[PDB]
Design a protein around this motif. Sequence first.
Motif, mmCIF file in Angstrom:
data_model
loop_
_atom_site.group_PDB
_atom_site.id
_atom_site.type_symbol
_atom_site.label_atom_id
_atom_site.label_comp_id
_atom_site.label_asym_id
_atom_site.label_seq_id
_atom_site.Cartn_x
_atom_site.Cartn_y
_atom_site.Cartn_z
ATOM 1 N N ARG A 160 0.847 -1.185 0.000
ATOM 2 C CA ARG A 160 0.000 0.000 0.000
ATOM 3 C C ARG A 160 0.884 1.237 0.000
ATOM 4 N NH1 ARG A 160 -5.340 -0.570 1.540
ATOM 5 N NH2 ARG A 160 -6.026 -2.676 2.142
ATOM 6 N N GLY A 161 0.592 2.175 -0.895
ATOM 7 C CA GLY A 161 1.357 3.403 -0.975
ATOM 8 C C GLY A 161 0.473 4.628 -1.064
ATOM 9 N N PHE A 174 -0.002 6.538 -3.776
ATOM 10 C CA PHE A 174 -0.612 6.686 -5.090
ATOM 11 C C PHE A 174 -1.344 5.443 -5.572
ATOM 12 C CE2 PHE A 174 2.618 9.961 -5.018
ATOM 13 C CZ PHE A 174 1.969 11.034 -5.597
ATOM 14 N N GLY A 175 -1.328 4.355 -4.812
ATOM 15 C CA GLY A 175 -2.035 3.162 -5.239
ATOM 16 C C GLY A 175 -1.690 1.976 -4.362
ATOM 17 N N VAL A 202 -0.350 -2.470 -4.505
ATOM 18 C CA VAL A 202 0.362 -3.513 -5.234
ATOM 19 C C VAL A 202 -0.283 -4.853 -4.913
ATOM 20 C CG1 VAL A 202 2.529 -4.710 -5.606
ATOM 21 C CG2 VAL A 202 2.522 -2.233 -5.299
ATOM 22 N N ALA A 229 3.779 -9.398 -9.615
ATOM 23 C CA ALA A 229 3.148 -8.364 -8.813
ATOM 24 C C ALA A 229 2.577 -7.303 -9.741
ATOM 25 C CB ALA A 229 4.134 -7.724 -7.839
ATOM 26 N N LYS A 272 1.436 -3.389 -9.766
ATOM 27 C CA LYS A 272 1.440 -2.079 -9.129
ATOM 28 C C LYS A 272 0.433 -1.191 -9.856
ATOM 29 C CE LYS A 272 4.719 1.462 -7.575
ATOM 30 N NZ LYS A 272 6.151 1.870 -7.616
ATOM 31 N N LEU A 331 -1.591 2.315 -10.059
ATOM 32 C CA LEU A 331 -1.552 3.717 -9.673
ATOM 33 C C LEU A 331 -2.819 4.410 -10.153
ATOM 34 C CD1 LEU A 331 2.154 4.520 -10.584
ATOM 35 C CD2 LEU A 331 1.221 3.531 -8.484
ATOM 36 N N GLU A 371 9.060 6.842 -13.507
ATOM 37 C CA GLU A 371 9.261 5.483 -13.010
ATOM 38 C C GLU A 371 9.279 4.472 -14.149
ATOM 39 O OE1 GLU A 371 7.831 3.877 -9.436
ATOM 40 O OE2 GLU A 371 6.496 2.417 -10.389
ATOM 41 N N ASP A 413 8.432 -7.957 -10.467
ATOM 42 C CA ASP A 413 8.825 -9.163 -9.749
ATOM 43 C C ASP A 413 7.976 -9.338 -8.499
ATOM 44 O OD1 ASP A 413 11.308 -10.190 -11.221
ATOM 45 O OD2 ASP A 413 11.939 -8.136 -10.780
ATOM 46 N N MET A 450 7.299 -10.079 -4.783
ATOM 47 C CA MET A 450 8.029 -9.934 -3.519
ATOM 48 C C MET A 450 6.981 -9.819 -2.412
ATOM 49 S SD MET A 450 11.443 -9.770 -4.167
ATOM 50 C CE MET A 450 12.209 -8.785 -2.880
ATOM 51 N N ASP A 484 8.456 -4.972 3.320
ATOM 52 C CA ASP A 484 9.687 -4.204 3.227
ATOM 53 C C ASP A 484 10.434 -4.260 4.556
ATOM 54 O OD1 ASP A 484 8.174 -2.458 4.830
ATOM 55 O OD2 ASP A 484 7.649 -1.181 3.130
ATOM 56 N N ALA A 534 12.310 1.447 3.772
ATOM 57 C CA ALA A 534 10.967 1.254 3.239
ATOM 58 C C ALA A 534 10.982 0.773 1.795
ATOM 59 C CB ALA A 534 10.162 2.549 3.355
ATOM 60 N N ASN A 535 12.057 1.045 1.054
ATOM 61 C CA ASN A 535 12.152 0.693 -0.354
ATOM 62 C C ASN A 535 12.963 -0.575 -0.590
ATOM 63 O OD1 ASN A 535 10.593 2.893 -1.131
ATOM 64 N ND2 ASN A 535 12.377 4.231 -1.409
ATOM 65 N N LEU A 542 12.361 -4.562 -0.325
ATOM 66 C CA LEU A 542 11.378 -5.612 -0.116
ATOM 67 C C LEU A 542 12.056 -6.950 0.143
ATOM 68 C CD1 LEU A 542 9.245 -4.595 -3.145
ATOM 69 C CD2 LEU A 542 8.656 -4.148 -0.777
ATOM 70 N N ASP A 600 10.584 0.728 -6.425
ATOM 71 C CA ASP A 600 10.106 2.096 -6.598
ATOM 72 C C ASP A 600 11.209 3.016 -7.103
ATOM 73 O OD1 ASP A 600 7.751 1.074 -5.566
ATOM 74 O OD2 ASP A 600 7.338 2.867 -4.366
HETATM 75 O O1 LIG Z 1 2.649 4.811 -4.683
HETATM 76 C C1 LIG Z 1 3.602 4.229 -4.297
HETATM 77 N N1 LIG Z 1 4.920 4.842 -4.387
HETATM 78 C C2 LIG Z 1 5.066 6.176 -4.954
HETATM 79 C C3 LIG Z 1 5.228 6.088 -6.469
HETATM 80 C C4 LIG Z 1 5.219 7.139 -7.350
HETATM 81 C C5 LIG Z 1 5.400 6.617 -8.624
HETATM 82 N N2 LIG Z 1 5.513 5.292 -8.502
HETATM 83 N N3 LIG Z 1 5.406 4.995 -7.168
HETATM 84 C C6 LIG Z 1 3.448 2.833 -3.697
HETATM 85 C C7 LIG Z 1 4.399 2.350 -2.805
HETATM 86 C C8 LIG Z 1 4.262 1.087 -2.256
HETATM 87 C C9 LIG Z 1 5.341 0.527 -1.236
HETATM 88 C C10 LIG Z 1 5.305 1.382 -0.011
HETATM 89 C C11 LIG Z 1 6.421 1.030 0.980
HETATM 90 N N4 LIG Z 1 7.787 0.974 0.380
HETATM 91 C C12 LIG Z 1 7.860 0.293 -0.946
HETATM 92 C C13 LIG Z 1 6.679 0.520 -1.904
HETATM 93 C C14 LIG Z 1 6.725 -0.649 -2.935
HETATM 94 O O2 LIG Z 1 5.732 -1.564 -2.566
HETATM 95 C C15 LIG Z 1 5.819 -2.854 -3.100
HETATM 96 C C16 LIG Z 1 5.476 -3.931 -2.285
HETATM 97 C C17 LIG Z 1 5.538 -5.226 -2.770
HETATM 98 C C18 LIG Z 1 5.945 -5.464 -4.093
HETATM 99 N N5 LIG Z 1 6.091 -6.602 -4.801
HETATM 100 N N6 LIG Z 1 6.513 -6.319 -6.046
HETATM 101 C C19 LIG Z 1 6.642 -5.005 -6.152
HETATM 102 C C20 LIG Z 1 6.281 -4.407 -4.903
HETATM 103 C C21 LIG Z 1 6.219 -3.082 -4.412
HETATM 104 C C22 LIG Z 1 3.162 0.315 -2.608
HETATM 105 C C23 LIG Z 1 2.211 0.798 -3.494
HETATM 106 C C24 LIG Z 1 2.356 2.061 -4.035
HETATM 107 F F1 LIG Z 1 1.423 2.540 -4.904
#
Ligand SMILES: O=C(NCc1cc[nH]n1)c1cc([C@@H]2CCNC[C@H]2COc2ccc3[nH]ncc3c2)ccc1F
Lengths: 618, 339, 57
Positions: A170-171, A173-174, A176, A189, A191, A193, A210, A243, A245, A249, A292-293, A295, A306
């Motif tokens: 969960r982030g 902007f959206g 995963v 996975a 993602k 947005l 991105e 990928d 994951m 994190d 946080a970034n 995983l 990210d």
């Molecule tokens: O919205 C988000 N980020 C801002 C942005 C702006 C443009 N692209 N992303 C954003 C973030 C996250 C988390 C938040 C914590 N840290 C990591 C980051 C990545 O999350 C994961 C988790 C499991 C995964 N498996 N495979 C891929 C992968 C990613 C999740 C959803 C989002 F929309």
Amino acid sequence: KKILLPEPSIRSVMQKYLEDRGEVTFEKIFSQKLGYLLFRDFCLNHLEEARPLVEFYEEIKKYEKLETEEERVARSREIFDSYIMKELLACSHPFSKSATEHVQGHLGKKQVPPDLFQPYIEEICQNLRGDVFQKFIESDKFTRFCQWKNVELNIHLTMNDFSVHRIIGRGGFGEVYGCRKADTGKMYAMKCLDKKRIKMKQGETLALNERIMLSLVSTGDCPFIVCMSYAFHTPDKLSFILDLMNGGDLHYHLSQHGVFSEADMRFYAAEIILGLEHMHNRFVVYRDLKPANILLDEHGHVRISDLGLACDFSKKKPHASVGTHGYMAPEVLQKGVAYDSSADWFSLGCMLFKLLRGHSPFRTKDKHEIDRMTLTVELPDSFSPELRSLLEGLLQRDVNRRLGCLGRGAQEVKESPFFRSLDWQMVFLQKYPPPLIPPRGEVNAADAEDTKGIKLLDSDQELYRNFPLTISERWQQEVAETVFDTINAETDRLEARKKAKNEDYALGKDCIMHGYMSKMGNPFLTQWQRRYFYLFPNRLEWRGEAPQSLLTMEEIQSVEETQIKERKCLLLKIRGGKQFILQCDSDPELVQWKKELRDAYREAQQLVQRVPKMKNKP
Amino acid sequence: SELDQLRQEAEQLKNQIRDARKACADATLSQITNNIDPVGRIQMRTRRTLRGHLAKIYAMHWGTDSRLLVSASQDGKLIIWDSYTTNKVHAIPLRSSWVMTCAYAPSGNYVACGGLDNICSIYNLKTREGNVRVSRELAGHTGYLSCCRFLDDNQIVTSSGDTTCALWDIETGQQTTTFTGHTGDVMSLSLAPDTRLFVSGACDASAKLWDVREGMCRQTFTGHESDINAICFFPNGNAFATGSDDATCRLFDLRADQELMTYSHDNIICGITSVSFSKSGRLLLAGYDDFNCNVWDALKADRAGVLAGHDNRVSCLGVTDDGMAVATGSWDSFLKIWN
Amino acid sequence: ASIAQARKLVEQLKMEANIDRIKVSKAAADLMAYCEAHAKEDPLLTPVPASENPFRE
Ligand SMILES: O=C(NCc1cc[nH]n1)c1cc([C@@H]2CCNC[C@H]2COc2ccc3[nH]ncc3c2)ccc1F
Ligand SMILES: [Mg+2]
């Protein structure tokens, strides 16, 4: 729901499509996963001249992947005494003198590095192109390559091509999701947005950047970065296929486990370095490195994710202050001062200290306090002298004194006495046991109540025209490890029952291109007849029986691509004011038919003009 | 200068030929035949319609059996029709789409065709188990093949857009003789009945009479104002007729070395694509670009009848050796037999 | 431009000039005499009954 290959008649249109792009060279087909598999499938079974050449290549590639010198000593003798010594006794050894002297010279001294047979790699290739590569294009294996290549260039993904499962991230902007691509069954996975969340938060620049950063990195199969296989978008969502994951994190695990010891952090450190080395070899600065970034997979190994804040510095270096407070390098916070990859190595030292002492080194909740404490450094007594030397070098404020920025890149950090016990080849092969193994599935293992009231204009949608993308190296690898073998077998059975059941109309003449299309008769009845079309320099015939009707290049006035029922189709205008619309089975076919028909009527009409018997007179 | 003298000498020779011709015009063919009774509204109906050929028809030719004919179409095919039953005897798929002319051999064992491929292709018909295939590809012209006609089963005469004609030995593929003299694309050729001479009309607005065995040009006929698209010998071999883009047919006598008659009307404006004589030489048939075929009185120049079939250009025609019927080929993909 | 081309043209015009011609009245009569001698052998001029006509039954 499975993959359907087109009939071998697709070869006519595909071979011209590829030849117009120079994709039919040895350097471009050999270096593709499916192309190599089909090329060797031809050399091993369908030919006896190049069979020992490819098996020599395969025995060398096995030797490169040997882990220890004890194994390379036993393999180098076998490859020499079989693919060099035995071929040399029969005098049919087609290699230069310098190649044998290099391999034999090392074997007498018994020095066997993984690149021993590299001089042969250059020459095995030279013996496979220009001669064996031409007989291969004639064979039925290159037809199978055209069938597979047609599927790749006809990829159009939507949400219905994936079976979406639980949420794993969960982030802002959206979200995963963990999903399965029904096409081949590969776990991924997703993602997602929200474009409406993007417009309100003014995050249009991040999502666009991105995708560009994922495209630079998702080649070469890096085990320590979250790489991209596809990217597509729905009217209100952006979708990346990444990928899988599903282990949370580190920012989450740091709270549940507490701080990590030096030895437990050493694991996470090594893998993150190899991931940074991959981005720096491709001119990408991450400048957002924080727990946080990072995983965790199902087993405990880690990747960077990210790349929204990462930018490309292959031509111009950044200077703006971008990152998370507490990990930004001193030259990053200073607006107007340029910087390169040096920003990541400082962020590393911030993150690595946070895993050891629970908080950022510069902490206790004001942003301006953290910016100043790190702008212009005490280490606890419970740090080993080798660990001190690493952080002291990594957290140097001067860019000239910071470890990993002195002209060799990631190799400098590897040579730190803190990693004196690691074999980085074993690190790359994910052979070291991870400290923390994630559980069976928790909640919000990757997190940080307002909504919106806005819609998306047509102008906002124009920023997402070139958003669809398919990484060719990824799709072929995904197929090669799932269904490439069993589908080839099923298609071989169907093409065999067709030949055992059935004189071609194209050979011996001057035909340009032949294949299947669908012309429309009565549009009100949704009438679409599918005929096999033959393109000649002066006419276009079709049959379903011999060709009973045709269309001459003199009749054609213009060729236009149009849309019919949300499907791209060709529109031909005829001399008598009539219209003639065709529909192809794939995007490459439509691109090729449009190009060749435009060239056929323009060339035929210019030739008839200069022939008194054929041209039109008042 | 010598080049100036050879131009003035070639100019005086042209005047000398013109005066020698004007010295033989004591009367006209119109005056000579002003006494014989007219033919009288020749009206013919379509007896057979040869269906097929997926595109335009460019050329046809009757066989000596006065029953079989071959045609060349825009669809890259030759069809050897049996005119009595409209049954397609042979359907020959050509190796080139740009075909312009065809011919039936006198013995009926071979056919030939060609076009923008610049090659005359000899297709054999007597090989066992069907499958008619190329027995020889005659290469030598540097321009499009416009017309070809057989002498026997071993010699064929061709005319090309390289402003030349040629004579081939079919057995060895050698270009035996080249007929140079035209200054524009040679369009049509017709053989004399004795097969020792042939005429040829070209885009230089001039026809020429050639000695096949000596390989020279004997006489050159001017008069037309535009391209000469078709040419046809008179049944006895002393005269021939030409069809031009100037919307006129003209009769030329060899022994008089000049034009005798002009076949024209004020309503007809489009050009002629083909010409042929009836068996007795009294009727002159000409195909036009207005989708019609006109029947002329060759002795009195009156218009006898009009073959009003087809929906596009009449691209070719021909009378059988027995004079029983007339075939016409059109740009509308059809062949019709008139009688 | 070619001198040899101008010789070949003058020699050709000599060939076309040094021939024996006849009066147009003579040539016109011989043509008219051919059409008369074979007007009865021409199925297009003189109509032929349906039995002899292969394209009508
Ligand atoms: O919205 C988000 N980020 C801002 C942005 C702006 C443009 N692209 N992303 C954003 C973030 C996250 C988390 C938040 C914590 N840290 C990591 C980051 C990545 O999350 C994961 C988790 C499991 C995964 N498996 N495979 C891929 C992968 C990613 C999740 C959803 C989002 F929309
Ligand atoms: Mg800066």
